[PDB]
């Protein structure tokens, strides 16, 4: 319950206090309704049974008040559960794009997926499914025990003593089954990730024959998950036993005290028979809590994953804004240094890109030139040093102004599951259809429209897997060119393109009418014909720079690199 209050918005704290007051009031009315039976039957069996009308009226009033309170508790619990759901899911959706790139480790990415995947109805009705009955069942025998004190002090003390073993059984059941449940949750998450990999990497797994359950990674994860699942069922046996023993101990304590008072004459026979029914009402929560306790640990793990994602380290950001009406800014690296963990990618790299010129970045593979584009676009940030757009440190820029300043063609072009037009329109959803068609024409997407059966309405798979490699690349290029960013970063836009489409797209990138600062990464000299300046990036540092013809005549690493 403690972790839930952290996730509740500050807006809904007013409803939580009302929820808690009504939940306590509901438990009190249930206890008073159960204990009112004792005066009721005591008068009912007397020689003047008409006295029972007074107690029946109180029982009816407590019952109707029980209906109203528990209905309002359900309504408030429903609102609180969805209020927590909507706000925490929006916070995860709004925070994750700002989370640092290095945070998305395979374990953290699994955690993020599970947290978002918790949007289903199980998390939504949590306050009604779990907290409302858990709090009610836990406090009901205590409330009956407190209420019995008005009838007989030692009898109420006996009920409270029975409540002590209940919390004792609850604590021991939790502590015994925590380790097994934690391992069960870990293995279940592992199996989910391997299923996702199994469906995504299905081509490569089949070719490698690691696809049968006897051989595949998912098969091993299933074996571990089933083993952990059966162990969890084993370690819940002491929980079931301890709750049963707690119920029997409470029954023996309650019945023995009532019998002891009846023998001593401090308790009438009709009160004792009424107490049999109260004992049954007293022992029902001992069984309800047993059914609710296993779900409590699983919920705690779920909310822990949600809180972990909300606690992710957001990337630094400021509020500066470029003073350009979509005009070309200058770009510079000022002694930039960057590393992935202990691996240094860039150290001492420095360059300056003029606003209206097109610059090429080349060099061996694994040399850090995609890192340079990512730092320019703000996806990464330096460990030390600073990168400036138009003389403004991008780490101090508004995130809206940071992402409205750059449009990027990624090395591995990812497309979302949807129509081809929607992927193109992601660059600028409010685009004029004249502007969209111009973007499609420049990217040679018009070939796809005329050649594909469905045109721009062609459905793309998860990723760009329902299209060819060279076709998802052109759709991504159309997506980048549609956006009116003054900085255009091209990360191998012609890797998977034939020579004809490569030449057409390469001419289009330079022929893009609006002014921009263009940074192009290429492994093919035909794709950087128009670049005004070069940045040869080898071993993480810009070894040499100049024009293409200038470096070719120089006979440095450029000429050998293009031999």
């Amino acid at each position: 319950i403690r972790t839930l209050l952290r996730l509740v918005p500050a807006e809904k704290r007013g409803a939580v206090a009302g929820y808690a007051v009504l939940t306590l009031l509901s438990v009190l009315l249930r206890a008073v309704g159960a204990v009112l039976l004792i005066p009721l039957l005591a008068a009912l069996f007397s020689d003047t049974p008409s006295d029972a009308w007074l107690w029946l009226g109180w029982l009816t009033a407590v019952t109707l008040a029980g209906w109203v309170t528990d209905t309002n508790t359900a309504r408030l619990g429903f609102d609180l559960g969805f209020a927590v759901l909507s706000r925490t899911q929006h916070d995860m959706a709004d925070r994750l794009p700002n989370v640092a790139m290095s945070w998305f480790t395979p374990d953290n990415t699994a955690t993020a997926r599970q947290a978002i995947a918790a949007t289903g109805p199980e998390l939504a009705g949590l306050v009604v499914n779990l907290l409302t009955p858990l709090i009610g069942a836990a406090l009901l025998p205590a409330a009956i025990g407190v209420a019995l004190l008005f009838v007989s002090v030692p009898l109420g003390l006996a009920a409270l003593a029975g409540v002590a073993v209940l919390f004792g059984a609850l604590a021991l059941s939790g502590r015994l089954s925590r380790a097994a449940d934690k391992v069960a949750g870990e293995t279940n998450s592992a199996f989910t990730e391997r299923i996702i990999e199994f469906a995504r990497t299905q081509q490569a797994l089949r070719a490698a024959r690691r696809v049968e359950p006897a051989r595949s990674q998912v098969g091993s994860a299933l074996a571990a998950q089933h083993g952990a699942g059966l162990r969890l069922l084993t370690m819940q046996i002491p929980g079931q036993v301890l709750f049963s023993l707690a119920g029997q101990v409470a029954l023996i304590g309650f019945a023995g005290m009532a019998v002891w008072l009846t023998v001593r004459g401090q308790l009438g026979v009709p009160e004792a028979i009424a107490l049999i029914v109260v004992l049954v009402r007293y022992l029902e929560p001992f069984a309800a809590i047993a059914d609710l306790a296993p779900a409590l640990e699983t919920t705690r793990a779920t909310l822990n994953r949600i809180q972990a994602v909300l606690d992710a380290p957001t990337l630094p950001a400021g509020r500066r804004r470029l003073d350009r009406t979509g005009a070309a800014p200058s770009i510079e690296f000022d002694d930039v240094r960057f590393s992935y963990g202990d691996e240094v990618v860039l150290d001492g790299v420095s360059f300056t890109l003029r606003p209206g010129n097109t610059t090429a970045i080349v060099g061996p593979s694994g040399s850090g030139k995609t890192t340079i584009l990512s730092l320019i676009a703000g996806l990464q940030q330096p460990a030390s040093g600073r990168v400036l757009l138009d003389g403004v440190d991008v780490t101090t820029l508004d995130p809206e102004a940071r992402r409205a300043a750059v449009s990027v063609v990624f090395q591995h072009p990812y497309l979302f599951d949807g129509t081809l037009r929607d992927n193109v329109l992601v660059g600028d959803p409010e685009a004029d259809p004249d502007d969209v068609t111009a973007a499609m024409r420049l990217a040679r997407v018009d070939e796809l429209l005329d050649r594909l059966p469905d045109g721009d309405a062609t459905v793309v798979g998860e990723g760009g897997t329902a299209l060819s490699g060279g076709e998802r690349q052109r759709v991504s290029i159309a997506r980048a060119l549609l956006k009116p960013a003054p900085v255009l970063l091209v990360d191998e836009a012609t890797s998977a393109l034939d020579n004809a489409n490569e030449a057409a797209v390469v001419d289009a990138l330079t022929a893009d009418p609006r002014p921009r600062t263009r940074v192009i990464v290429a492994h093919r000299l035909a794709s950087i014909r128009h670049a005004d300046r070069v940045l040869f990036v080898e071993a993480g540092r810009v070894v040499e720079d100049g024009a293409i013809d200038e470096l070719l005549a120089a006979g440095g690493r450029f000429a050998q690199f293009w031999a």
Binding site: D70, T119, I195, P453, A496
Partner: protein, 559 residues
């Protein structure tokens, strides 16, 4: 429909029905004993009879709880065992379906099928039948016994049962459609959630957090949950209050006290109602909550059995070494969308075959057909004479190795990624395979060495994960190799080295090379130009240029 899936749980389910019928009768037995205890207690009976009934009642309360705990332990074991078996069957089926199944269905759907649907069968195959028999036998046995005692108060017990049944029926009807739509919505949100995490760089630069498709459909999904769960929970809690033991205990007394106060009833006959009349409410509430679970489970069975009934890449009965022979092959991903048109091509040992052409012309599809990821719609593909439809997966993939355009890497150690084709291969073989692909130099600089993990956020670069897949294919050492754009991202120096290593390995092997870098396939013994799904010219590099066909145009455009 669904019963075909649950046939193996024939006898466990009937045994559960009978055992829970006996167990709940055992649970009702103490309250009958305690009623007899109460009647004797008013009668001033001998203490031995009071102790006997009292101690027997407490003993049977323990016995009922122990048997109930013992049953659900066994029945959850049976449910866990069946779910493990069913998940194994689903993985085995998915291991041999046509691979267009995965592409059109996605990965979120596969996660829902294997894991969530088998989990959705939980309440059906361990809680449905016990709750159903309990919710039938206990109200029937109680209400008959209390009808015999005094029908007058039994009728006011019928009232909340009728009210509860009306609430159960309208809730089931009202939420039936929404429950049917629920797995589709979870499927779609699973896809959006996966894309929101996988395509993060696209989400960041383009649109940002606010304009993303994920939040657009997240609002629709949560709105659907609110519209589904609000009236559903509303009926769900009215069922609690109607079937609440306090509600039964109140209405029992409302019809008892006026009869007791008047000369219409003796208060001794209220003892069965107060002791038994409140105990069947919680059992009726079982199926009241459980019909939604039974609906979800039955649909989940339908969604699972529909996949186990899916057509697969069956192995036929009909039943030069290293010769892959396409013959009149045609293929269409969708009906009426021919992507390959009457291709005839023979791949022979010792020859390097280059497959070039315009993008989107079906080259990778032809390579996939060689892998038998999809079966040819017409014609036949033969490996060493044997049609691939007569070859098992072991026999097929032991002959044809593949480097795929998408350099897919699996979560796990680098050695596990290179040693995917043969996980039992020694570490020396893995090192030599990596050195051939020119990735060993990068691997040694990783912090954990070959044991380093290649998950998301720790993966290699595009040009380096590609060399890992080339290292994977080199380690496989198949008599036939199919390079679907190797060195797509490799620089010209690394490209030359790895191609030199490939050209060293595959002299006695059959090579199919798909390449856009036409300068890398000038040495090929046979260049095949594929345009719009049909071959348009074949020959050597000099022959194609002299012919002046489409290859001449593409070669000129490359300059």
């Amino acid at each position: 429909a669904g019963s075909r899936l649950l046939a193996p749980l024939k006898k466990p389910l009937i045994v559960s029905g009978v055992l829970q019928a006996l167990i709940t009768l055992i649970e009702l037995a103490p309250f009958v004993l305690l009623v007899e205890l109460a009647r004797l207690l008013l009668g001033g009976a001998e203490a031995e009879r009071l102790w006997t009934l009292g101690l027997t009642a407490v003993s049977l309360i323990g016995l009922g709880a122990v048997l109930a705990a013992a049953m659900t332990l066994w029945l959850h074991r049976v449910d866990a065992r069946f779910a493990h078996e069913l998940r194994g069957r689903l993985l085995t089926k998915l291991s041999r379906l046509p691979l267009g199944w995965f592409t059109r269905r996605g990965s979120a759907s596969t996660k829902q099928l294997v894991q969530d649907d088998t989990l959705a069968l939980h309440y059906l195959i361990t809680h449905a039948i016990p709750d159903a028999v309990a919710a039938v036998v206990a109200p029937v046995a109680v209400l008959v016994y209390l009808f015999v005692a005094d029908w007058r108060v039994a009728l006011v017990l019928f009232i909340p049962v009728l009210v509860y049944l009306v609430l159960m029926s309208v809730m089931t009807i009202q939420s039936g459609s929404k429950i049917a739509q629920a797995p589709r919505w979870a499927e779609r949100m699973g896809g959006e959630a996966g894309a929101f995490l996988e395509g993060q760089p696209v989400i960041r630069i383009f649109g940002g957090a606010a304009a993303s498709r994920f939040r657009r459909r997240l609002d629709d999904y949560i709105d659907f949950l609110v519209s589904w769960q609000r009236p559903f929970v509303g009926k769900k809690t009215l069922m609690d209050l109607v079937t609440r033991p306090a509600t039964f205990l109140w209405i029992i007394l409302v019809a008892g006290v006026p009869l007791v106060v008047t000369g219409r009833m003796d208060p001794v006959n209220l003892l069965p109602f107060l002791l038994l009349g409140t105990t069947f409410g919680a059992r009726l509430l079982g199926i009241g909550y459980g019909l939604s679970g039974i609906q979800t489970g039955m649909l989940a069975a339908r969604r699972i059995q529909t996949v186990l009934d899916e057509p697969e890449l069956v192995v036929r009965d009909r039943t030069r070494p290293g010769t892959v022979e396409l013959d009149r092959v045609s293929f269409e991903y969708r009906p009426g969308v021919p992507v390959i048109r009457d291709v005839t091509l023979t791949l022979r040992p010792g020859t390097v075959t280059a497959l070039v052409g315009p993008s989107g012309s079906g080259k990778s599809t032809l390579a996939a057909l060689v892998a038998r990821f999809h079966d040819v719609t017409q014609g036949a593909i033969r490996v060493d004479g044997r049609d691939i439809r007569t070859l098992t997966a072991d026999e097929l993939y032991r002959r044809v190795g593949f480097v795929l355009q998408d350099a897919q890497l699996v979560h796990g150690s680098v050695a596990e990624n290179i040693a995917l084709a043969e996980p039992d291969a020694g570490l020396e073989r893995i090192r030599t395979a990596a050195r051939d692909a020119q990735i060993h130099d990068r691997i040694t600089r990783m912090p954990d060495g070959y044991d380093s993990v290649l998950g998301a956020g720790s993966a290699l670069s595009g040009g380096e994960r590609q060399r890992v897949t080339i290292a994977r294919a080199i380690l496989a050492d198949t008599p036939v190799l199919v390079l679907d754009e190797a060195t797509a991202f490799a620089d010209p120096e690394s490209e030359y080295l790895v191609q030199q290593a490939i050209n060293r390995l595959t002299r006695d092997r059959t090579v199919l090379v798909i390449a856009h870098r036409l300068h890398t396939i000038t040495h090929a013994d046979q260049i095949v130009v594929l345009d719009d799904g049909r071959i348009v010219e074949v020959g050597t590099h000099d022959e194609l240029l002299a012919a002046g066909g489409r290859y001449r145009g593409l070669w000129d455009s490359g300059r």
